[PDB]
Symmetry: C3
Subunit: 115 residues, 3 copies
């Protein structure tokens, strides 16, 4: 056909509105999509507003350019290439702080912090 | 109308079940959505269970709060702010290990590792 | 029923093609899905091709295994565990470079860079 406009007894909406070219699904509890090949979305802007969590349960997540986050937790290691510029706190490894650490010196005293 | 309940000859299902408020798409090979503006999902929990890969092919991925990963690979650099606490292995740069590295000292010997 | 094949006056397509088991939504401007519980996608490959941005506006994004990115920006700190191997530039914290930094030594001179 030529239309999609559904109002359900639970208050859900599933429709397409060609005047504004808007596909709307609202008022549902769950959605799922199960496919054997691929799911693709091609659009300038993707917004996911998830008040609990977004889980990407996969061997690999690839971000092709920039990734921005508030906090980061890495569990099992990694690699980094390129200039990595840390500021605004301490970058420590096993308690040793990059910008402030000292060493025993070579003649019995202590070095200063990094120059 | 008021219902959406489709069973296809390939075994796929596309339906909405208002008793449980559940939208189900199953038994398909591929899905795609192509839009000129935006795609938005607003829901407490998003689960993506992808046995091969999730690719976010975009100039920028933004996580507004926490990001947790198993391993991390950064290809082209970055910035970090705030306290970054590494433990449980070596944090190295060009082979130099933050928590264990030593230097030639200022009078001919070698420093100890970081205090 | 047993079919889903819609052509709209704006040129949009919403259909399922059982010959190839392909669900297609195309030629739209916006889509949104609003749910009170969860949205789940289970499929080997997820592709998001977003010419402006992907935003995960959530307390927590979890990648269960590998995360790969071009650049990284961490705004508010974090933790890292496991071996983290940086190469191919400078890893600095508050201007102090892991692989090249020096210290005042313990007898009035300057240390060398890391061994
Ligand atoms: Ca000395
Ligand atoms: Cl010294
Ligand atoms: Fe040092
Ligand atoms: Na530490
Ligand atoms: Na290294
Ligand atoms: Na720095």
């Amino acid at each position: 056909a030529d239309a999609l406009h559904i109002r359900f007894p639970d208050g859900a909406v599933i429709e397409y509105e060609p005047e504004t070219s808007a596909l709307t699904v609202s008022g549902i509890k769950t959605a799922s999509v199960t496919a054997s090949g691929s799911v693709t979305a091609t659009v300038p802007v993707v917004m996911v507003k998830a008040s609990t969590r977004v889980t990407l349960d996969t061997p690999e997540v690839v971000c092709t350019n920039r990734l921005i986050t508030g906090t980061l937790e890495v569990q099992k290691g990694g690699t980094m290439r390129g200039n990595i510029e840390h500021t605004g706190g301490e970058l420590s490894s096993n308690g040793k702080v990059l910008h402030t650490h000292k060493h025993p010196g070579d003649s019995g005293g202590t070095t200063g912090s990094p120059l």
